[PDB]
Ligand binder design. Sequence first.
Ligand SMILES: CC(=O)N[C@H]1[C@@H](OP(=O)(O)OP(=O)(O)OC[C@H]2O[C@@H](n3ccc(=O)[nH]c3=O)[C@H](O)[C@@H]2O)O[C@H](CO)[C@@H](O)[C@@H]1O
Ligand SMILES: CC(=O)N[C@H]1[C@@H](OP(=O)(O)OP(=O)(O)OC[C@H]2O[C@@H](n3ccc(=O)[nH]c3=O)[C@H](O)[C@@H]2O)O[C@H](CO)[C@@H](O)[C@@H]1O
Ligand SMILES: O=C[C@H](O)[C@@H](O)[C@H](O)[C@H](O)COP(=O)(O)O
Ligand SMILES: O=C[C@H](O)[C@@H](O)[C@H](O)[C@H](O)COP(=O)(O)O
Ligand SMILES: [Mg+2]
Ligand SMILES: [Mg+2]
Lengths: 652, 652
Amino acid sequence: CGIFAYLNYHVPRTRREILETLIKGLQRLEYRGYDSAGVGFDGGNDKDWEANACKIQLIKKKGKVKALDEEVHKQQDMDLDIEFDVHLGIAHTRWATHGEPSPVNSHPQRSDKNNEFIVIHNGIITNYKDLKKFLESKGYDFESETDTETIAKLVKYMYDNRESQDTSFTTLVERVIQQLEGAFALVFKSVHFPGQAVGTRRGSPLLIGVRSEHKLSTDHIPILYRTTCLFPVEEKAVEYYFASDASAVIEHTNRVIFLEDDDVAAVVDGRLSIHRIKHPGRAVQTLQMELQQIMKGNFSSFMQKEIFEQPESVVNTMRGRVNFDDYTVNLGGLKDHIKEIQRCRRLILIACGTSYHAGVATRQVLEELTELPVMVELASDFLDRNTPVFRDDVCFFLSQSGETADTLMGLRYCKERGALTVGITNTVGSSISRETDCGVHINAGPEIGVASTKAYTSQFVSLVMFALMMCDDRISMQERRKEIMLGLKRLPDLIKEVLSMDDEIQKLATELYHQKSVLIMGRGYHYATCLEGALKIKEITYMHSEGILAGELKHGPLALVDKLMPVIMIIMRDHTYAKCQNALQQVVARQGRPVVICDKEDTETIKNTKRTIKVPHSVDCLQGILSVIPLQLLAFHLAVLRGYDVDFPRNL
Amino acid sequence: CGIFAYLNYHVPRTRREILETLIKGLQRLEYRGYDSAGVGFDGGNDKDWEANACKIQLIKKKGKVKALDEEVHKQQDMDLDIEFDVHLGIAHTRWATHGEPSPVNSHPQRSDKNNEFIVIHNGIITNYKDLKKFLESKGYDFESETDTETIAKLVKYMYDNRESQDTSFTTLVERVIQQLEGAFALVFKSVHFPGQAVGTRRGSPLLIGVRSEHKLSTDHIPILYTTCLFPVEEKAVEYYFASDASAVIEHTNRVIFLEDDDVAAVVDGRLSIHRAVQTLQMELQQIMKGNFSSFMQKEIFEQPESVVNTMRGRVNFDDYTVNLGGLKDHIKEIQRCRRLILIACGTSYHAGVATRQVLEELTELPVMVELASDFLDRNTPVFRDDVCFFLSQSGETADTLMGLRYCKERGALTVGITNTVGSSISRETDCGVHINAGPEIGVASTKAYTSQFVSLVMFALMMCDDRISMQERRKEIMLGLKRLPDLIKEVLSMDDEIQKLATELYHQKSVLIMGRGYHYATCLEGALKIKEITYMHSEGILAGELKHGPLALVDKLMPVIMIIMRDHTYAKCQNALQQVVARQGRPVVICDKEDTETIKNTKRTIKVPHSVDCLQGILSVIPLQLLAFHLAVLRGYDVDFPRNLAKSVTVE
Ligand SMILES: CC(=O)N[C@H]1[C@@H](OP(=O)(O)OP(=O)(O)OC[C@H]2O[C@@H](n3ccc(=O)[nH]c3=O)[C@H](O)[C@@H]2O)O[C@H](CO)[C@@H](O)[C@@H]1O
Ligand SMILES: CC(=O)N[C@H]1[C@@H](OP(=O)(O)OP(=O)(O)OC[C@H]2O[C@@H](n3ccc(=O)[nH]c3=O)[C@H](O)[C@@H]2O)O[C@H](CO)[C@@H](O)[C@@H]1O
Ligand SMILES: O=C[C@H](O)[C@@H](O)[C@H](O)[C@H](O)COP(=O)(O)O
Ligand SMILES: O=C[C@H](O)[C@@H](O)[C@H](O)[C@H](O)COP(=O)(O)O
Ligand SMILES: [Mg+2]
Ligand SMILES: [Mg+2]
């Protein structure tokens, strides 16, 4: 789940400093409720290194990384003062799956009782049964209930059967992954290759950070098949960081290499090369990420931080992309494709969960400004039906993580059929970001919370900005674009206005504290609002909230309304205003006493309804952002009132 | 909203026979609305009926028709023994979507405290506010908050400002409708015009039945701008104004289906139309419960028969041929189009969701499925080469009808899938199919859903009848249709097993119904049925979306129904079941009989027989229909008359 390794090559570090670096990396990767973690390093207290390289020591523990860090310093035999000019340490944090949390079942997994090979793994080996039986027939005894141990045992099998005494660490790993089936990200360490690391992935993210006070040989590592590698030019000193997430690297360096499926990256003599079995290469790029972005700060939870910082993340999404003087929108990621997109005949938005709601939330304005048909598909269903896709379709894939399975498989489906693919993602280097022809990084910052908050609103704004590009040549739409863009200009301050009503939301959370259901009703631009709000309250509050399209009430669902059923209705001053007034009269006529989220100046309804949240008025195709935030906050406060940890996931 | 009036010209009927006839006609229309009812007849207790037509009596009460039938009786002032040789009585049941269902807001409305003009109205007047102000200035006092009172107060304004002393009742009504906007179906009665009825319409149904032992003068009344329909040789005739054919079939099968702006009038027992007389293709048995306790139960258990009727004369199993006569002169042009759009509401929308996949498979065209209300809110792009389907049991749903006219304006080819011959949607569509499911009386659609399902499948079988590669697939499906009626009987034989399950859920507040693929519509339709008639908080959840939030709502106390069938999504649905169980859920599973795997590992299962994947949805939804039925009975509710709504939403 969380991989981190630190390789210091001719950068002298003490064992204390090394272990501190490993522990700190796991804290960046540790999320609420990780049960097992461990570290692997060179044991032995012989003065100076080189003699302590043939003693791999493991310290694994069941619990949080805090307990591990205490165990690290709770070692009487170890001396934390030895200095290593060259050393490789690896670490892992996990939520136990194949087995039960126990020190043995934690990572790293070892190849034997002397720890000749150890490995840390993210993923699942589907065929680990066949592999385990084979290794046992060849005489390898197992000790854990994990599929990872088969990896440690298999690499030693390849070593015990090597043809020459100097077969590379890379070759051994290559022979291992050939026998593996499923998804994996791996980092290997061995006494037979002191100071060397090998990292490889298949369907699981893995990256390498590099730092050196000296110039590096290149910024584009070429691939070697079965100048040519990265290394400090005029000196040896260099540091490498393997990790499954940039969060554990950004505080040490912002220069990273994203590995790809079946890449085998190896560090030999302090030099990094990337091998393949099959010119192309892997780029050393600069991440805009910052350590402060993955911290709670003064907020008591990541959910609270990411809700209340939405004035900032919205501004981050638009920076360098909008100009309110000449009313121009420039999404850099679509420069080399915007003209081709405009020659296509249909837009298909494919996503899961809240990302899908972002498409529902912008479907109308995309239809309005592109004038093309716009299909919005749930990825899982999109695949089940084998949806017809064509070469003149443009397919969008909305994914904060860029790794969701069904969305990624939908991407590959549409590529097979020759469609133009576009990514709306929030993770640089992710599978969906790489494999899409083009796209937009919404630049919302890392989303650490359990539920999507700023990602939904940054996706929202990103699609609106795209729609504004698609109509930049239409005279008849110049005024509509100005209205929308002046809405984006004012949007950050309007969000602050909504957040300032947090006290009113808590009063609503008190009303619904003891309730077991709540219907959220909306239509038009706010169909997505009531769907997203119902999902948030389900995911965070664990109560039965359901979004109901207002225009469907009189077709059945209205039967639920009575004096006891809590109802939240969204009524804004747009073209559907009178229709929403109609639905309100239908609810009240059946003893419903709903709460209404309406515009700040809607004096007509504020005097008729029980309780009303009064959000500020904005352009119709942006109101969804302002009207969903009270539902974000409502889920947060309800969960807190009930003693729940909003940063602790339940689905798992 | 239903209309019914009884005019017996020279056919002696006592005041008890007329009132019993008015109430009996409303009961035939009660399913179109049951929040209030009323009647309007002649008062006074004079043996000579001629000296009583100057006194109008209104009896209106809140509740169903049974509340009115008891209010009409046990009255100390109305002598039910007066013989009327000529009399006109109007009645009306109301679906109070707004305001209170009080007697004052019920119909017939009145023009003054003496009841000089009373009217019954079905629809909405879109400018009743401007008409109310004008009438209030001229000295007319209003009492109710309905839009129908503006029609009663206006016909008196045209009568108080007439040019000649003998302006026909038609002339007065003609001047009224010229000031009315929107849709309406009206039936007037006045003391100045004793026994004279006037029936006009505009966007609302309104027919006139006739019964007479004597020959009728003609069989095609000529419209005006050797003229009237009346008995030859004698005067005995009985008329039956009604907004539906079920209230007239019991007395006669000879009606006159008016058209928009046709002002029918019965003067001296002669029917004339200002500005056909066909036989009804309906039998009385089709609108009778028979041996069942409710119409819904009948219409569920008669699905084996209604499915056969939908295929009658259309599916030939000896040679595996499909021919839908309604699409004969259009099937070739439909194939040259580039997209299908299905537009409907509620259960009719689910019928499209249930057939979207197979339509995509056999036509290879894009298939977009739209909720009518949202389709209109977004101004969805439509083109000339679009084929737009409109699924409507009643053929009068406002939003579905608006979508039709919307698509027609953009030059799309429009196709109707309806169950009511001569309805708005059936007439205004270019072509279509009458599903021939028979009259549906229960508010909740049961046989209409499965008949729409089958009808869209038959269309798909036509669209691929020239593909060699699809021949075996067609035969597979058609064999499934041949076996479908008997498999429905097999499901119905499990009614008792369903009733037992109901006794284990009726006390619960919520139930989650989960499904994917072909059974996404099944869990959406079942959730809607349980909402509508049992008032449980039932929600359908696409199985593939569980891992994206909703799964957090599942615990050992949340009821869950899962649909796991033997199609290509079986392995994925087994994964969902495992997720639900990991969350401590104890789900009820609707699965296939041969699915011994699921049956063994689940204590509560409903085993339905196997069929073709694209037909299984018909068999999987029937248990949920029955479950909703039994749950409602256990909770003490009337399955035919659910609360807060009625059947057919003909007014938005
Ligand atoms: C990742 C990166 O270095 N982005 C830089 C880019 O931002 P810029 O906004 O110009 O472009 P993006 O960050 O949005 O995307 C970067 C590239 O990845 C592609 N892409 C992105 C998302 C996706 O889902 N699929 C996809 O293919 C884009 O088409 C584009 O070619 O120029 C800016 C300078 O003006 C820098 O501040 C940004 O650091
Ligand atoms: C109403 C009628 O007399 N139908 C006859 C017709 O049925 P048949 O099955 O041939 O055609 P339908 O009854 O389904 O429809 C009748 C006509 O109305 C049109 N239409 C129907 C539904 C709709 O929603 N929109 C629309 O425009 C059809 O295109 C068609 O032109 O031939 C059969 C003999 O084989 C007879 O048993 C049916 O009595
Ligand atoms: O709050 C809910 C979750 O965020 C849920 O909606 C879903 O898991 C994502 O929205 C989709 O995942 P990606 O956004 O990473 O594609
Ligand atoms: O059980 C629910 C009802 O059947 C309802 O959903 C109905 O389908 C629509 O309200 C109108 O649709 P029609 O136009 O087909 O009558
Ligand atoms: Mg890319
Ligand atoms: Mg027609």
